[PDB]
Each structure stands twice: as structure tokens, then as C-alpha cells.
Amino acid sequence: AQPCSDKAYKIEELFYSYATHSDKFTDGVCLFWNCNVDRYPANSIVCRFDTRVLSNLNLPGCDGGSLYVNKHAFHTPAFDKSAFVNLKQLPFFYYSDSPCESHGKQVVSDIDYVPLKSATCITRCNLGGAVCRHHANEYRLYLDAYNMMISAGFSLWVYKQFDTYNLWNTFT
Amino acid sequence: FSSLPSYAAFATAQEAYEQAVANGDSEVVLKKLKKSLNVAKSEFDRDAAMQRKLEKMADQAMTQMYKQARSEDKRAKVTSAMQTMLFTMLRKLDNDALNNIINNARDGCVPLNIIPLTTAAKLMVVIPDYNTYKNTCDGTTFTYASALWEIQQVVDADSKIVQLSEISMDNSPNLAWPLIVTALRA
Amino acid sequence: VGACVLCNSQTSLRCGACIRRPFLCCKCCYDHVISTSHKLVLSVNPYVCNAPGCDVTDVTQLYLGGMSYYCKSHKPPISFPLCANGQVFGLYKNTCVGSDNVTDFNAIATCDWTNAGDYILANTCTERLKLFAAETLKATEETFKLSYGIATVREVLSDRELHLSWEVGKPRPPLNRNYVFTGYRVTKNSKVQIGEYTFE
Amino acid sequence: KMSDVKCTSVVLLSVLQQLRVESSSKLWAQCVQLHNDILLAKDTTEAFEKMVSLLSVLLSMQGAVDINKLCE
RNA sequence: AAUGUCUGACUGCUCCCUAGCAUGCUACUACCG
RNA sequence: GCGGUAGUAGCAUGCUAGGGAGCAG
Numbered sequence: 151a152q153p154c155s156d157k158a159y160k161i162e163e164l165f166y167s168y169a170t171h172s173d174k175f176t177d178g179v180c181l182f183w184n185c186n187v188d189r190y191p192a193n194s195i196v197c198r199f200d201t202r203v204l205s206n207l208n209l210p211g212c213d214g215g216s217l218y219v220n221k222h223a224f225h226t227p228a229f230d231k232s233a234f235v236n237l238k239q240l241p242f243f244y245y246s247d248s249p250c251e252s253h254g255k256q257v258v259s260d261i262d263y264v265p266l267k268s269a270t271c272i273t274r275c276n277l278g279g280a281v282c283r284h285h286a287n288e289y290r291l292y293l294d295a296y297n298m299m300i301s302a303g304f305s306l307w308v309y310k311q312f313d314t315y316n317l318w319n320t321f322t
Numbered sequence: 323f324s325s326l327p328s329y330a331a332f333a334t335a336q337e338a339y340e341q342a343v344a345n346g347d348s349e350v351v352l353k354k355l356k357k358s359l360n361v362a363k364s365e366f367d368r369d370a371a372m373q374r375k376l377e378k379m380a381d382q383a384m385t386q387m388y389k390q391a392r393s394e395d396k397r398a399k400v401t402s403a404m405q406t407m408l409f410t411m412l413r414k415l416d417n418d419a420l421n422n423i424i425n426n427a428r429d430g431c432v433p434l435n436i437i438p439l440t441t442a443a444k445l446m447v448v449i450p451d452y453n454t455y456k457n458t459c460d461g462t463t464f465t466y467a468s469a470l471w472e473i474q475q476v477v478d479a480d481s482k483i484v485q486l487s488e489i490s491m492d493n494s495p496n497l498a499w500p501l502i503v504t505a506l507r508a
Numbered sequence: 509v510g511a512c513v514l515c516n517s518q519t520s521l522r523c524g525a526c527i528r529r530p531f532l533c534c535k536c537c538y539d540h541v542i543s544t545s546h547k548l549v550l551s552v553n554p555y556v557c558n559a560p561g562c563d564v565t566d567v568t569q570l571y572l573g574g575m576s577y578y579c580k581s582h583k584p585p586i587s588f589p590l591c592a593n594g595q596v597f598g599l600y601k602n603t604c605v606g607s608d609n610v611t612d613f614n615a616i617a618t619c620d621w622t623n624a625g626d627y628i629l630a631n632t633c634t635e636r637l638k639l640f641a642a643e644t645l646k647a648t649e650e651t652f653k654l655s656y657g658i659a660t661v662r663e664v665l666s667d668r669e670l671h672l673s674w675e676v677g678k679p680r681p682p683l684n685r686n687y688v689f690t691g692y693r694v695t696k697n698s699k700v701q702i703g704e705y706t707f708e
Numbered sequence: 709k710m711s712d713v714k715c716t717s718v719v720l721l722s723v724l725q726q727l728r729v730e731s732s733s734k735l736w737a738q739c740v741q742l743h744n745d746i747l748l749a750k751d752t753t754e755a756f757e758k759m760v761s762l763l764s765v766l767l768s769m770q771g772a773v774d775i776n777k778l779c780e
Numbered sequence: 781a782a783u784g785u786c787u788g789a790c791u792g793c794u795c796c797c798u799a800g801c802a803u804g805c806u807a808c809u810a811c812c813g
Numbered sequence: 814g815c816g817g818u819a820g821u822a823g824c825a826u827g828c829u830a831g832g833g834a835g836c837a838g
């Protein structure tokens with residue numbers, strides 16, 4: 151709804167509302183990433199900051215929403231449930247696609263990463279071991295990062311047709 | 323539940339059933355690939371079920387033994403955890419009197435009773451050697467717990483009353499090192 | 509879960525056939541299992557093939573097929589050897605040091621403590637191996653001289669109520685917490701243990 | 709802030725009691741008296757002076773080697 | 781040499797975990813009519 | 814082509830029992 155000087159020819163000036171534009175962007179997948187609107191289109195990806203969370207950053211704004219101040223002061227409306235009626239929560243995981251920690255042969259001949267295995271780190275080495283120690287440390291750090299963000303209060307959501315099997319299938 | 327030979331069996335069953343429904347076969351052939359695929363599910367559901375049961379069983383066993391180990395190891399070490407917690411709290415408080423007496427005690431000056439509060443009620447202190455006496459008892463006054471005290475009697479380790487002016491740096495070896503001071507509140 | 513008693517590098521492994529069950533980094537555990545009679549390692553789970561009856565307790569004969577542990581004749585088509593690359597499949601594999609003179613502990617473990625030379629060996633190593641030799645010497649004493657214990661059950665009664673019987677004439681040890689025995693059921697076949705057992 | 713005083717007084721009494729001080733009688737009575745007085749105080753200053761009077765007990769004994777924990 | 785034991789009332793409601801049984805619901809397979 | 818019984822698994826509800834906890838007078 152506020153396009154810059156340039157990128158205006160890219161980013162068309164649009165304010166969203168499910169009272170209108172609900173029927174146009176039907177193709178593909180939207181992406182509301184911290185742009186707080188009304189109920190979202192059924193094929194969206196959103197990271198909306200929760201407001202009832204407490205901390206020392208966010209401050210009691212108005213009205214029934216809070217002012218979230220760390221860099222530039224962001225004001226966000228009151229958290230409501232009727233915004234995600236067309237979406238579902240996002241279960242945690244950890245996709246990845248990269249080479250394997252191969253201190254030698256690249257396939258089946260290089261493991262030496264002793265892990266009691268997870269069930270959701272859909273990495274590239276999930277055979278039996280099952281995480282190239284590379285991906286082991288990467289999964290550890292990414293898990294910590296997800297935890298910290300969600301503790302600082304960010305609630306993700308996804309379209310209801312989401313699945314996890316398909317990434318596994320993409321691996322092969 | 324993928325890492326199963328029964329998974330390969332069931333997947334071959336699904337693929338063959340798909341071939342039967344996609345090739346336009348006759349009526350009884352799809353019954354062979356429906357009765358076998360359904361016996362295939364009646365075995366695959368079953369083996370995946372039992373394996374997830376054994377898995378969750380091992381998992382709850384793990385959480386139980388973890389709970390036990392944690393609880394016992396903590397119960398072992400209360401006598402020290404409490405002390406370290408107490409002292410970090412005391413340091414975080416940051417008051418003048420508390421820190422005064424803690425530093426006096428880590429040097430060697432400890433009381434011999436409860437520090438009273440009224441202007442009466444005596445107070446006794448142990449002095450280890452005379453330097454701290456310089457840093458503290460100056461004349462008839464006495465500063466302890468950030469409050470003023472009047473010295474009224476001194477004595478060394480062998481219960482000998484020791485005159486005030488008697489003490490000095492020169493005569494210092496002429497006294498038992500652990501002196502004792504009896505003061506009152508100002 | 510501990511520190512390699514030789515290397516201090518953090519180990520999740522213990523030496524099974526060894527009397528004290530100590531912590532040895534992947535390299536040190538490797539060295540012990542290739543330089544002594546100790547072929548059993550103890551971690552979160554005991555290292556053995558989990559095929560029915562496959563009593564493969566040799567550390568060098570196990571392969572991680574699927575999620576369970578397997579011998580050669582049992583490993584599914586997806587596996588690899590644990591005892592390989594100079595180290596063992598043990599946690600903290602990268603942060604492993606490998607002691608240079610494992611022969612020290614390799615001799616402290618496979619001795620009998622009846623010869624004075626073993627006492628010289630204990631007196632003539634570093635302080636860590638000194639206290640290790642202390643623990644293992646007291647352990648050799650108690651396992652030999654200080655009291656004893658084999659008993660064969662007569663019949664089961666309930667989940668925690670059991671008829672026993674030692675061997676007539678064999679040292680019948682006291683029944684205390686600091687007295688546990690390796691429970692062996694032999695099918696015919698299958699010299700498999702059922703764990704550690706104290707009685708009262 | 710005052711809550712911090714009340715809290716550290718609780719912890720201090722716990723330490724004293726686990727150092728077997730309740731074996732002696734009159735001393736334990738005094739310690740309990742000071743603790744229950746601190747828990748009900750309203751202003752910070754007199755609570756602080758009761759706190760120092762009560763800490764003097766732990767300092768008067770040689771069971772806790774403060775020169776160790778005062779290492780920061 | 782032991783081992784072992786230390787003060788915890790009467791009620792009411794609620795959550796969590798496990799077990800058992802029956803019942804109830806649904807699917808797969810089998811036999812006979 | 815149907816019924817029935819028997820099995821097995823899945824799922825639910827309920828009741829009992831066992832254990833852990835919370836609040837109330």
C-alpha cells in the first residue's frame with residue numbers, strides 16, 4: 151500500500167482486504183510476512199507477531215494491540231483468532247539439501263556422526279545413522295534459533311494442504 | 323514406518339493394484355490385487371503398529387530413567403547448591419553493612435554472638451593480627467557493620483587484658499595474635 | 509556419558525569385559541578392544557546383535573543396520589562397521605584424543621594383582637592411572653577374596669518373589685545392595701544375560 | 709526490592725537449619741524470631757538491620773568457608 | 781557386623797499417567813446357512 | 814448377491830483399580 155519511488159513499477163500500490171482481493175490472487179501462493187491484515191487467503195504463508203506475549207521489548211500500545219519496539223517502533227493490532235480460519239499452524243521441521251560431511255567417499259561410506267536419530271530432521275543423510283555430523287550441528291543450531299524466535303513471540307501458519315512426505319519424495 | 327520389508331511388499335501391492343486399475347483389466351484379477359493388498363494392509367498396519375508400540379515403550383522408559391537420575395543427582399547436592407545460591411543472592415543485594423561484615427569475615431574478623439541493635443547490649447569481635455586493627459579500631463571508636471562502637475576492653479588469646487595504648491607496630495609481637503575486642507553500640 | 513579416563517575427552521562408552529567399566533574415547537576404546545581381551549563396550553545400550561539369540565559381543569563384529577544393532581549375518585542391506593577408522597561409533601567422535609600408552613591400562617585391566625610387578629606398575633604411572641589402579645585393585649580384591657555368589661533359582665513365585673538355591677558348598681555371599689550378580693539364562697544355546705540383580 | 713530481602717532471608721534460614729543449628733535451643737528460637745519478623749516487615753531499612761543481625765549467626769561459626777565462595 | 785523403621789486427620793472436587801474388563805463403534809479375514 | 818458367527822487390528826466411550834499432583838473447609 152506504500153510503494154517506493156522505484157520498485158513501484160514492481161510493487162504495485164496495494165492495500166489488502168479479504169473483503170475484496172480475496173478472489174484475485176487465487177493463483178499460486180501469497181506471502182503475508184508480518185504485514186498484518188484481516189483474514190488471510192487460503193493459500194498464504196504468514197508470520198504474525200503475537201501481542202499478548204510479555205517481555206521488555208513490546209510495550210502496552212493501543213488499542214488491545216501493543217507497540218513492539220526494538221529497532222523502528224512497530225505497532226501491531228490486537229491478536230485475533232478469526233484471521234487464520236483458512237490456515238493451520240506450522241509443525242516444526244528442518245528441510246535441507248546440501249552435500250554430506252564426507253571425510254572420504256560421498257555416499258554410504260561416510261557417517262562417523264553417532265546420533266540417536268530424530269524423526270523430523272529431513273536432511274540428506276537420514277538413512278540409519280542418520281545425520282552427517284555437519285547436518286547434526288546444523289540441526290542443533292537451527293532448533294535453538296527456532297526456539298528463540300518463537301519465545302520472542304512469532305506465530306507461523308500455513309495452508310491446510312501442507313505435508314512432509316513430499317519433501318522426502320523430492321529427496322530421491 | 324518406511325524401513326520395512328513389509329513396506330516393500332505393501333508398496334509392490336499398491337503398484338500392482340494401480341496397474342490393474344489403469345490397464346482396464348477384467349473383474350476377478352482386481353479381486354486378487356484387492357484381497358492380497360488388503361491382507362497386505364492387515365499385515366503392514368500390524369507390524370508398523372507393534373513397532374511404534376515398542377518404540378514409544380522404549381521412549382517412556384527413557385524419560386522415566388532420566389527423571390530418576392535427575393532427581394537423585396540433585397538430592398545429592400543440596401548442601402552446596404544452597405550455599406552458592408545464598409551467596410549469589412547476598413552479592414546481588416549490595417548493601418553496605420552486609421558487604422562490610424562479609425569482607426571482615428573473609429579477612430578474619432568474626433563476631434562471637436548476635437550483633438545486637440540497641441545502644442546497650444555488648445558486642446565481641448575477634449581480630450586476627452594487628453593490621454586490620456589499624457584499618458578498624460582507631461582510638462576509642464570502633465566501626466563495625468557500618469555503625470560506631472566504643473571499645474571497652476581488649477584481650478589476647480591467653481585471656482590477658484591488654485591496655486589500649488599498649489598495642490603498636492613495634493610492640494606487636496608482644497601480644498597473642500587473635501585479639502578480642504568488647505565494644506558497645508554508639 | 510563421561511570423560512575418557514585417559515584422555516578426558518568426553519565419552520559415552522564403557523568397557524564391558526573390563527572390571528570397572530570405564531570411559532574411553534572412541535580412539536582409546538578402539539585401542540583397548542584391539543590390544544586386550546575386552547571386546548564388550550557399554551553405552552546407553554549394550555553393544556550386541558539384536559537378532560534373536562545372536563550373542564555377538566565382539567565389538568568388531570557389529571554393524572548398524574536400520575535402527576537396531578546387527579552382526580554380519582543379520583545386518584540389513586543398509587549398514588556399516590562400528591569398529592572402524594581407528595575409532596568406534598561413539599558420541600563425540602570428532603573430539604577424541606586417543607592415549608599414546610594405552611598399554612598402561614591395557615596391562616592394569618588384564619592382570620591378577622597377585623604379582624608385585626603389577627603393584628610397581630600401579631605405583632609408577634600418572635595420578636589418574638594411580639587412582640584407576642586403586643579402584644581396580646580394590647575391585648580385584650572384592651571379586652576374589654572378599655565374599656562371593658552364584659545361585660540357581662528353584663522356581664518363580666511372583667514378580668518380585670523367587671525361590672533360589674546356591675551351589676552346595678559354593679561361597680554363599682550376603683544379600684545386600686553392594687552385591688549384584690549377572691543373570692544368565694541359557695536356552696541351549698543363547699548364553700544371554702538378563703541384567704544385573706541384587707537380592708534380599 | 710524488599711521481596712529480595714524476604715527471599716534471601718528464607719534461603720538463609722534454610723541453610724542454618726541444615727547446618728544442625730536447631731539442635732541448640734535458644735539460638736534456634738532467636739533465628740526463627742528474626743526470620744518471622746523479616747517476613748512481615750513493611751519498610752526496607754529495619755528489615756536490613758534484622759537481616760544483618762541474623763547473618764551474624766552464620767558468620768559466628770566455622771562450618772561454611774566463605775573464603776572459598778567469595779571467589780566470584 | 782547387622783539390616784530395617786521414624787509426627788502427615790476427616791471430607792469434597794479437579795487434572796495427569798497406567799492397567800484391567802466389559803460394553804459400544806468401524807475395518808480386514810474365515811466358516812456355514 | 815445377502816445373513817450369521819468367529820477371529821484380529823484400529824478407534825471411542827464408560828467403569829473399576831493403581832499411582833502422581835492441585836485447590837478448598
Ligand SMILES: [Zn+2]
Binds near residue numbers: 249275
Ligand atoms: Zn550429509
Ligand SMILES: [Zn+2]
Binds near residue numbers: 513515516535606
Ligand atoms: Zn582417550
Ligand SMILES: [Zn+2]
Binds near residue numbers: 523524526527540617
Ligand atoms: Zn577394559
Ligand SMILES: [Zn+2]
Binds near residue numbers: 559562563564580581
Ligand atoms: Zn548377529
